[PDB]
Amino acid sequence: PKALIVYGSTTGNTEYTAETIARELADAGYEVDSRDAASVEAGGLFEGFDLVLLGCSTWGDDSIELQDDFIPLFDSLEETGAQGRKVACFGCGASSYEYFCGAVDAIEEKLKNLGAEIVQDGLRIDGDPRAARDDIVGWAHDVRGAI
Ligand SMILES: Cc1cc2nc3c(=O)[nH]c(=O)nc-3n(C[C@H](O)[C@H](O)[C@H](O)COP(=O)(O)O)c2cc1C
């Protein structure tokens, strides 16, 4: 299968999660294209992919704000070709906050409204992702079994 991973990361935690997920998928034989949201054009972005994984950290002071580089893509998500596309979301946040990983919920809700097929509920990491390696690995295994 061919998967696309697009991540929005300010301090590199969601980028480290995206790289862990990319290796799990490549180790199982998938074809994997991993891109920073900062380098991406929304226009037909998901075209030709069997699975699309979107990663984004949460910002703002209990007023959800998406990671800076991901904003433009979220704004033009209606142009990516998400209708009928198998997708799943992930991101890093702080479980202590009002909207823990609220950017993962917001992205899932728009994808749902755009006709995408959410194959798995979003992976929401608390704290340092390097300490949540087994959950990341376990979530990537489950998405593979869900497509
Ligand atoms: C100023 C500020 C606001 C934040 N807002 C939230 C929030 O509303 N909810 C949440 O779950 N995490 C929030 N975070 C936590 C960050 O999303 C978290 O540190 C995450 O690991 C950052 O990931 P990144 O390095 O991929 O950009 C906030 C952090 C800062 C510094």
From Swiss-Prot:
Pfam families for the chain: Flavodoxin_1 (PF00258)
InterPro entries under this entry? Flav_short, Flavdoxin-like, Flavodoxin, Flavodoxin/NO_synth, Flavodoxin_CS, Flavoprotein-like_sf
Q: Which UniProt keywords apply?
A: Electron transport, Flavoprotein, FMN, Transport
Q: Name one GO molecular function term.
A: FMN binding
Entry cofactors:
FMN
Q: Which residues form the Flavodoxin-like domain?
A: 3-144
Keyword flag Flavoprotein? yes
Q: Which PROSITE patterns match?
A: FLAVODOXIN, FLAVODOXIN_LIKE
Note whether Electron transport occurs among the keywords.
Answer: yes
What family classification does the UniProt entry report for this protein? Belongs to the flavodoxin family.
Give the protein's biological function. Answer: Low-potential electron donor to a number of redox enzymes.
**What is the official name of this protein in its record?**
Flavodoxin
